[PDB]
């Protein structure tokens, strides 16, 4: 279901927004989870360009530069 599917999100900063904050922070903190951003909500939170639309050019150019030569 939609409310169930929204539960799983790779980015923990994103999850901390609309889910229960405490649990997300703990449960992420134990596994040492590393948030790579890559999404909208998280990038909005951290205050940089949205990885879509006008910003899609930037992130792409950054995404390919990443994990590369």
């Amino acid at each position: 279901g939609i409310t169930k599917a929204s539960l799983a999100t790779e980015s923990f900063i994103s999850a901390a927004s609309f889910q229960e904050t405490t649990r997300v922070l703990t449960e992420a903190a134990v596994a040492g989870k590393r948030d790579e951003l890559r999404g909208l909500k998280e990038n909005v939170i951290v205050g940089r360009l949205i990885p879509a639309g006008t910003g899609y050019a930037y992130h792409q150019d950054r995404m390919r530069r990443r994990a590369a030569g």
Binding site: I2, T3, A5, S6, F18
Partner: protein, 50 residues
């Protein structure tokens, strides 16, 4: 109610008919004002999932 409103707005409505109309009105406002919130909650869940 098995005794409808036999009058209309062009004519006058008496005490009873108006009093009975009142419930329909209040339930209308309440229901719509609530469905706004339901809609919002739904859009929330939706953008969260997408």
């Amino acid at each position: 109610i098995e005794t409808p409103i036999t009058a209309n707005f062009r004519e006058g409505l008496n005490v009873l008919q108006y009093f009975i109309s009142t419930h329909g009105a209040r339930k209308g406002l309440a229901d719509t004002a609530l469905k706004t919130a339901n809609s919002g909650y739904l859009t929330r869940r939706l953008v969260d999932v997408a």
